[PDB]
Structures are given as structure tokens and as C-alpha cells.
């Protein structure tokens, strides 16, 4: 199981509800949406969907990482038992569990001027990473196709505010074996690592002793082909990445657009870190 490390040399804007604020990381269907839009840039979008639909391409979402420390969101248990301010724990320090600051959020103030009229300002929330940090994306069984797409994505930009002028990155794989054995392990409680949602006939079996938050996950369709306007998406509600489940489930790539000239998918497949 491989690593995908993302080094940003420019600020990022990962919006979650509005342009004025931003988020440290980006989700999994955000990266999958970027890969779909770039694959239909290359025309190979159909067999990329047939790869990601049949589990050979299965990635988690982005996580913070500092120099030789890979992080995850604080897994949230039914713990009966200060470190309550900390949002991220190192990925190998879960056994110890049972200082940290990457970057700083900034707000960039912009304007749009009209020539024979008064101007109008708008402001963009940004995030800038420190010099020896960034984000990393977990992936198992790397494919030549996704190695080609991320090689091609880095000149289009992950992030929100494009193409002015923020999201750009250079990636490298840099596989690791100190944390592959964590994912080869098996335990009794399995934490989630991506924004996921089980299929309708297994949500009950997935929902037994869980600890989760829903997140709304919608927005606008970003294409020049979906139905001659800016149509919103069917707001899918997926589990938060810092969830825990005692029993596993497998997600689906749900179609959240069913009215334009092409389908709009949303990645909601599961990715577990099994722990005792």
C-alpha cells in the first residue's frame, strides 16, 4: 500500500460552504472529482470510472503531514475516560493513544472593478502550508492511469479558487513500509479514513456501535457540458472521515447528477484503518 504526498508551493482554498472561509485538507470525492474532470480532459474518463467502481483504485482523503509524521483526524471512540484541543493525531500513535501546527489560514481580499461604475469587493479565504509540510493521500495498489492523471493534474490545480491562482502542487509517491503493516493489521474497531456512505441494504449492519458525524456534501457541477447553466448537486450526506465502526462496510460511487448531458459521480467508498 502506497503513499501520495502533495507539496504545495502556493496557497490553497479548500472551501466547504462558502468562498470567504477555507479548510486545511480536502476530501476524497474532491480528489476523485479532480481526477474525473482531468480524465475527461484526456478522454479516458470511462475506464477510469470502471477502475474506481471495481475497487482497484481506492484512496482515502487528504490528511496533514509534517516531516516524517503522517497524521489523521482524531478518531472518536465511545471512550469512557489538555489534549482535548488537538484535532490530529499521528497515524502510528494510536497504540500509544489507548507541537502540531502546519501553516496558518489567511484571508485574501480581492475586488472586481467595472469601468463606468463603482467596484465591488469579494474576499477569498486561503491556507498556506509551511515549508516542510503539506498533505498526503493514502492509496492501495497504485495504477499507471492514476500516476498519469496526477502527473497531469498538477498543472491544472487541486483546490477551489481556480484559475485565479491558488491551487498548485508537485507530487511524488514515496511508498512506506512503517505504516503498511498498520493497514495489514486487523482489530475489533475499524476507523474510517474517507468520506463514505454505505449502500442502502447494509447501512443498518454498518450502523451498530458507530461514532460518526454526517457531513453534507454537495455544491455546483463544474463542467461546460452539464445542462447549459450552474446546476447544484444532489447533496449526498456521507460519514465524516474521523469515524469509527466496529464492523466494516463498503461504499459506492453515487451518481448525484441525473439531469445534465453526462453523469456526475461522487466518491463515497470506505477506507479503514483496523485497530484493536
Amino acid at each position: 500500500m502506497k503513499i501520495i504526498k502533495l507539496y504545495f508551493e502556493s496557497p490553497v482554498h479548500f472551501g466547504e460552504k462558502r468562498l470567504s472561509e477555507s479548510k486545511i485538507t480536502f476530501s476524497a470525492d474532491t480528489l476523485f472529482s479532480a481526477l474525473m474532470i482531468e480524465a475527461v480532459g484526456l478522454g479516458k474518463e470511462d475506464e477510469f470510472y470502471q477502475l474506481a467502481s471495481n475497487n482497484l483504485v481506492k484512496f482515502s482523503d487528504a490528511f496533514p503531514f509534517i516531516d516524517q509524521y503522517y497524521y489523521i483526524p482524531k478518531p472518536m471512540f465511545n471512550l469512557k475516560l489538555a489534549f482535548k484541543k488537538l484535532l490530529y493525531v499521528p497515524i502510528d500513535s494510536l497504540e500509544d493513544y489507548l507541537s502540531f501546527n502546519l501553516g496558518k489560514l489567511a484571508l485574501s481580499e480581492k475586488v472586481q472593478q467595472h469601468d463606468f461604475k463603482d467596484s465591488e469587493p469579494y474576499n477569498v479565504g486561503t491556507f498556506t502550508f509551511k515549508e516542510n509540510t503539506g498533505l498526503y493521500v493514502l492509496i492501495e495498489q497504485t495504477h499507471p492511469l492514476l500516476e498519469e492523471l496526477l502527473e497531469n493534474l498538477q498543472y491544472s490545480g487541486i483546490g477551489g479558487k481556480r484559475n485565479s491562482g491558488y491551487g498548485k502542487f508537485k507530487f511524488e509517491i514515496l511508498e512506506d513500509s512503517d505504516i503498511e503493516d498498520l493497514f495489514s493489521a486487523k482489530g475489533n474497531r475499524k476507523i474510517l479514513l474517507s468520506g463514505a456512505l454505505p449502500k442502502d441494504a447494509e447501512l443498518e449492519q454498518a450502523l451498530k456501535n458507530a461514532s460518526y458525524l454526517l457531513e453534507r456534501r454537495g455544491g455546483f457541477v463544474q463542467s461546460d457540458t452539464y445542462a447549459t447553466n450552474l446546476v447544484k448537486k444532489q447533496d449526498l450526506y456521507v460519514f465524516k472521515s474521523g469515524s469509527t465502526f466496529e464492523n466494516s462496510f463498503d461504499g459506492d460511487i453515487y451518481q448525484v447528477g441525473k439531469k445534465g448531458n453526462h453523469p456526475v459521480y461522487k466518491y463515497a467508498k470506505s477506507f479503514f484503518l483496523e485497530v484493536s
Binding site: 442502502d200 447501512l203 453534507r216 454537495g218 447544484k232 444532489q234 450526506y237
Partner: protein, 741 residues
């Protein structure tokens, strides 16, 4: 035989003792209670009379067979026992003619016991001034019987407008919080003089109704054998109390779920709306529990702790209330708002605090609340919540939400209702709920929030209609209950507000404050030895009471050009002229220190912006400023920037004595300011990087203008610019900002 008699025997209790401590009748107080009975509307049945004149143990054993069973004063006896926190087994109770009871002693302050293991045991009391503006102090106090007979004449000339029945408990409770807020619970016994007897009566009413419904469900007989043929422990070793709670999560992201134009109005709208939703949700639960409002311990910002009975019928109605409230939030606020109702069971011995075990009752309730918070929605709720998704070409701009949008305009129905109702909202305005209103509330009854206008005529025959009030005057058929919300507004136009100022720079100053270390102080603040439940109720209710009424009165007594957006312990946001904001921050800090006996800290952040500046970016910037203040991890304040963080005494003392000295000195000088002050600030901010040569230039300029600015002021500036430097830069900056024409 219903609980009106018992709740009146609890709430109307110990009036005979508070008149016993001032009026000379040295006989047994049972005859005083019985003689006080018949001087009302009519004398009641024997139930309430025996409830209020039999709670003395020898008289209890003296009256067995001359009257019937179903005592209904055994309840109030062990109710006073459990609400007291200690035992009265066979001893003579208070004022029982057993010793020379010389009762002239005032009410002790709540904050003396608070955190006595870190800073020792202080002691204070509550003085009396003939709401309103008063503050507890460390001097001995005394009450006089003339004011007592005056207040009882007022109480009995306005009291007869109510009927001793079910619905009038609210109105007598409103007059009880008007009157009994400062009268003590007892005279001696320091373990009892810490709390006022008004909340002791509220607690006694709650626990009396709880044990009454407990015995109504368990269907038991012979209360005399059960409770007195053994010494009242066999009740205590049974589970009979359900102390449940409420917890709205994510209130902050719904208050600040605004990005539109009208962001001033929507902020106060949402901050009022969450509180009023919690109010009606709690009151409707008590209404469906056929219960009075005395069972509320505390309602705050997002939290509502309760005390009910432990019966299976209450469990069934609690689960039904769960399902209805959860479905109603999932209809309106998709995942945004969520209440976490969890009940915890305690035995009657368990809250007597003899074996301890009270802070872990709060801890267990927190564990169950977090457990329900971890697993929020069930399977079909998530399935329905994903299936109701649809795509549209419109959204609202605050609530970025693609359903329940109005026609011809693109703002969501709550998202516009909040703006409109925030527009028509003043001080003396009344809040009303019915089946027709504006703002959505469960279970299908809305809120109108209409003023004194052509729609006042609903209060005639206002069946199934409730009234939420700011002021209370009429206690006949009005029935207005108080909701604590603070909405001081000077002018409501920022341009007129600034235009009235003609002394300083034309800027708009912004205060954001919050109480730091409020969390563990609210959860576990009162120490385990002298630990009470009504003390915590008074603590939190007094905190919210302080912020609301003393904030409006402190801003009313001096004409401060400050618009309050919303107040509270957790949150405070005021926009006004910067002169009044700076001059009021020290006032608010010192009045909070006087109210809390300076052991609850407070931090704040002052920001300063121009006349026409957006309120959303204003609030975010000043919130950043006060976060930098609280990061220091003690009490402090930031003046206009994160680089200028000062402690409150440091700001007050150092900056304001330096500012007042500078203002005295440069006024009498005929031609010195302000060019000398700008050169002085230039040197005193260049000295941060080039430390030596600017100190030399400073000495050169001060002896240069020794003959001009003053002999002693120049050497004072030279002394201050080496000892406490960074203070004097801010003192000079706010001096010029004050004196710019």
C-alpha cells in the same frame, strides 16, 4: 386531590419563618401558619393547611388518627430534608421555641465557597439598597421589619389577582423572582445561608412533584409507616429522580451562517432564536409532563438541565418527545441543529451528598450526552435524508440551501423570517406564539414576535397561546413570563451615532468579550464539602441574569453610543463609537469583578474600524483579536491589534493614568501638540529595532523641550520610556485618536 396543593405548599413555604424573624409571636410557628392561612381569598381544604403547618417532627407524630391518611406533608418534610443537604431526624427545627433564636442575619454570597482549595475560604454577604443595581460585599448587613411589612402589604395588595390553581404557578413564580431573590433561606447554619429561598422553593416544588408522581405510579399506601416507622431512609434508597438535560450542538456555525447584506440583523436574530427555541422546547416538555416551570434548574446558551420524576410513563413520553423533536429538526435544519436529550437516574439517597456523588452525576450526564452525540441519527433518518435530495438552480445566500425557498426572491424562509423579525424588535416588545406566526418552532406552533399594536387583541381569549416577556407589570389575566434577552440600542443608525460624536476620529469601535475558564468552573466549580444543587442553579442563573439586565442597565444609566448585538456568558458583541467602547470595557470588567467577587476572569478584544465597514468581516476580525487576547492563558485584552495585548489591570492602571497625565499636561501647553507627539511616537516605535540611538535621540529631544513641555513631564516621559515602554506608545496613540478634530 392534585399537585396544586403540594406545589403551593412547597413554593409558599417558610413565609411564616421569615415573618417569625421580625414579628413578635413567641408561640409555636404552626399556629402562626394556621392564622396566616385564613386571611386570603378563601380558606382551602385541610390538605394544603396540613401541608404548610405540619413539618415539625413532634407535631408530625402528634397528629395521626384525628384526621385521615394521604398526609401530603410527609412529602414536604423529606423534601426540605433532601433540599437542605443534611439531616433533621428528631431535633427541634428552626424557630421552634427551643433556644433564644435572635434572627437578624443577612444572606451570604454564592462566590465565597467557590474554589476554596486554591485560594482559601472567603466570606461575603448580600446588602440591601432601597435587578436592581446592587452588588454583594464583605461587610455585615441587616434587614429591618419596616421594609418587611411594606413588602408584605405590596405582596398582599397585588397577590389576590391570582387563583391557587394549575396555571397560576407561573405568574406567582414571576412575582417570586421579582420579590424573593434576596431574602435568605435561614439565619444561622452557614451551610444554609448561602442560597436564597426562592430557588429553594423552586427546587422543593420540583422534588415534591417528582416524589408525588413517583408515588402515583408505584401505587403505594401507608406513607406514615414507610416514612416514619423507620427513620426516612427506605425512601432514600430508591431510584426516584430523573435529572435529564438538553444540548444544542453547533449553535455557533448557525449564528454565523450569514454572508448576505443584512448581517447585523441576522446575527442578533439567530442569537435570540436559539435561546427562544430552547425555551419553548423545555416549556413544552414541562407542559406535556403536566408540570410547572419550577423543575428547570438552569437554561443557558444551548443547555437546559432539568429534574423530573422517574416513572415509565415519563419514559414513554420522553421517547415520544425524542422522536418528534428529532424529526422536526431534521425537517428544518438538515444536520445543522441537534438536541441531545439524555436522562440519568439517581436514587434519593444519591443526591443528599452524604456519600458524595454529585459531580459524577454531571459527569455521567455528560457521558450520556456525548454518547448520543456520537450516534446521532438512526438508519431510516439517514436514508430519508439522502433520498430527499434534489438539484436546483437557486440557493439562498446565508443558508446555502436548495429547498423551501420563496418565489421571486432568493432567501430561505427562515433565512428571511429572521431578518424581518430582527428588524421589528425593540426593548418593551412582547413575544407571542400560536398556530399562526412567523418563526418556525416545534411542534407546529410558530412565533409572531409582534409589538404593542393592532395585534394585541389576541390576548383576549388567548387559549393555547403563550407570552414571552421583557418586562412584567400586569399579574391579572396577562400571564407574561420573562425571557432574558439583552437588546440595548442607542440609535440603530451608525452614521447618526458617529455624527453625534464631534471630539475624536470618525471610527466605529467594536467589543467582543467572553468569560474565560467558564467551562470547568461551570461544570465542577463548587467544592465537594459544602456542595449544593440550588447553589449551582443560582450560580448559572445569576450569571445569565447579570449579563442581560446589568448590561442593559449599565448601558442605560450613561448614554453610551453602543449598539448591543447579543450578550451572554459565552458570547458578547457590541458595535458603537470607539470612545464609548473603550471607556465602557473597563466599566464592564470592573462591574463583572464586583458581581463575581473577582474570581471569574474575563477577556475581551477591542477593535476599531471606519464608518462604513462590513459587519461580518468586523465580527470575524474582532473575534480573532479576542482569541489572541485569551491566548495571552489568563485574563487580558487586545487594543485594536494582536500585537498590543494588555492585562486588564495593566490597561486600566498604566494606560489610563498615562493617558490622563498626558491629557492634563498637553492641555495647558499652548503650542506643543501634536507634532511633538508624532515625533515622540516615531522615536518610541523606532526604539524597538534600533534600541540605542533612539534612546539617545529621545534624551536629546526631552532636554531640548525641557523648557517648553515642562520640567517634570519631560523627565517623566524619559522614565516611562525605559521602564514600561510599550504602554506609553498605546497611551499616546489613543491620545491623538481622542484629540483629532
Amino acid at each position: 386531590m392534585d399537585k396544586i396543593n403540594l406545589v403551593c405548599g412547597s413554593l409558599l413555604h417558610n413565609i411564616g419563618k421569615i415573618i417569625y424573624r421580625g414579628t413578635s409571636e413567641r408561640a409555636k410557628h404552626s399556629k402562626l401558619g394556621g392564622d396566616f392561612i385564613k386571611s386570603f381569598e378563601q380558606f382551602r381544604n385541610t390538605e394544603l393547611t396540613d401541608c404548610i403547618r405540619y413539618h415539625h417532627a413532634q407535631e408530625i407524630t402528634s397528629v395521626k388518627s384525628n384526621k385521615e391518611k394521604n398526609s401530603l406533608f410527609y412529602i414536604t418534610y423529606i423534601a426540605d430534608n433532601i433540599s437542605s443537604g443534611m439531616d433533621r431526624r428528631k431535633d427541634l427545627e428552626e424557630g421552634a421555641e427551643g433556644f433564644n433564636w435572635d434572627k437578624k442575619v443577612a444572606l451570604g454570597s454564592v462566590f465565597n465557597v467557590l474554589n476554596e482549595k486554591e485560594k482559601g475560604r472567603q466570606n461575603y454577604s448580600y446588602p440591601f439598597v432601597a435587578e436592581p443595581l446592587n452588588f454583594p460585599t464583605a461587610t455585615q448587613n441587616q434587614y429591618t421589619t419596616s421594609y418587611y411589612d411594606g413588602l408584605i402589604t405590596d405582596m398582599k395588595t397585588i397577590l389576590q389577582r391570582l387563583k391557587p390553581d394549575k396555571e397560576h404557578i407561573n405568574s406567582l413564580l414571576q412575582m417570586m423572582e421579582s420579590l424573593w431573590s434576596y431574602v435568605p433561606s435561614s439565619t444561622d447554619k452557614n451551610q444554609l445561608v448561602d442560597i436564597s429561598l426562592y430557588d429553594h422553593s423552586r427546587t422543593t416544588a420540583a422534588i415534591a412533584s417528582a416524589i408525588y408522581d413517583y408515588f402515583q405510579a408505584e401505587n403505594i399506601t401507608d406513607y406514615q409507616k414507610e416514612l416514619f416507622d423507620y427513620n426516612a431512609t427506605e425512601f432514600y434508597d430508591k431510584n426516584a429522580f430523573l435529572m435529564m438535560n438538553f444540548d444544542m450542538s453547533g449553535v455557533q456555525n448557525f449564528i454565523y451562517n450569514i454572508s448576505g447584506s443584512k448581517a447585523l440583523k441576522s446575527l442578533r436574530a439567530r442569537s435570540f432564536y436559539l435561546d427562544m427555541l430552547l425555551e419553548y422546547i423545555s416549556d413544552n416538555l414541562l407542559e406535556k409532563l403536566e408540570l410547572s416551570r419550577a423543575n428547570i434548574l438552569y437554561v443557558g446558551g444551548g443547555h437546559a438541565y432539568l429534574l423530573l420524576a422517574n416513572t415509565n410513563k415519563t419514559k414513554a413520553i420522553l421517547s415520544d418527545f425524542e422522536h418528534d423533536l428529532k424529526t422536526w429538526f431534521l425537517d428544518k435544519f438538515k444536520i445543522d441543529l441537534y438536541v441531545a436529550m439524555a436522562y440519568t437516574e439517581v436514587s434519593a439517597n444519591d443526591l443528599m451528598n452524604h456519600n458524595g456523588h454529585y459531580r459524577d452525576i454531571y459527569r455521567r450526564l455528560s457521558q450520556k450526552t456525548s454518547a448520543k452525540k456520537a450516534n446521532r441519527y438512526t438508519a431510516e433518518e439517514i436514508l430519508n435524508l439522502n433520498h430527499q435530495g434534489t438539484e436546483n438552480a437557486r440557493e439562498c445566500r446565508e443558508c446555502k440551501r436548495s429547498d423551501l425557498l420563496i418565489e421571486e426572491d432568493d432567501i430561505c424562509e427562515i433565512c428571511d423570517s429572521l431578518q424581518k423579525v430582527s428588524r421589528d424588535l425593540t426593548r418593551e416588545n412582547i413575544f407571542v406564539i400560536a398556530n399562526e406566526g412567523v418563526l418556525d418552532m416545534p411542534f407546529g406552533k410558530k412565533m409572531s414576535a409582534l409589538s404593542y399594536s393592532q395585534a394585541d387583541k389576541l390576548k383576549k381569549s388567548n387559549a393555547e397561546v403563550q407570552i414571552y416577556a421583557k418586562n412584567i407589570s400586569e399579574i391579572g389575566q396577562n400571564l407574561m413570563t420573562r425571557i432574558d434577552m439583552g437588546d440595548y440600542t442607542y440609535r440603530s443608525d451608525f452614521h447618526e451615532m458617529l455624527e453625534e460624536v464631534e471630539v475624536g476620529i470618525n471610527r466605529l469601535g467594536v467589543l467582543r468579550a467572553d468569560v474565560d475558564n467558564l467551562g470547568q468552573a461551570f461544570i465542577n466549580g463548587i467544592p465537594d464539602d459544602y456542595l449544593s444543587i440550588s447553589r449551582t442553579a443560582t450560580f448559572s442563573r445569576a450569571m445569565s441574569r447579570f449579563f442581560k439586565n446589568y448590561l442593559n442597565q449599565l448601558l442605560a444609566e450613561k448614554s453610551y453610543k453602543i449598539n448591543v448585538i447579543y450578550a451572554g456568558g459565552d458570547d458578547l458583541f457590541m458595535i458603537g463609537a470607539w470612545q464609548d467602547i473603550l471607556d465602557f470595557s473597563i466599566v464592564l470588567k470592573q462591574k463583572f469583578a464586583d458581581f463575581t467577587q473577582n474570581k471569574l476572569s474575563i477577556s475581551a478584544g477591542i477593535g476599531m474600524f471606519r464608518e462604513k465597514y462590513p459587519v461580518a468581516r468586523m465580527a470575524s476580525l474582532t473575534g480573532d483579536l479576542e482569541d489572541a487576547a485569551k491566548d495571552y492563558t489568563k485574563n487580558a485584552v487586545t487594543l485594536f491589534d494582536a500585537t498590543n495585548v494588555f492585562s486588564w489591570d495593566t490597561l486600566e492602571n498604566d494606560i489610563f493614568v498615562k493617558l490622563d497625565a498626558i491629557t492634563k499636561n498637553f492641555e495647558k501647553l499652548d503650542e506643543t501638540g501634536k507634532a511633538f507627539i508624532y515625533r515622540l511616537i516615531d522615536l518610541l516605535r523606532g526604539v524597538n529595532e534600533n534600541q540605542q540611538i533612539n534612546i539617545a535621540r529621545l534624551a536629546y529631544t526631552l532636554s531640548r523641550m525641557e523648557e517648553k513641555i515642562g520640567k517634570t513631564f519631560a523627565q517623566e516621559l524619559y522614565n516611562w520610556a525605559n521602564a514600561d515602554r510599550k504602554t506609553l506608545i498605546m497611551a499616546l496613540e489613543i491620545y491623538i485618536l481622542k484629540t483629532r478634530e
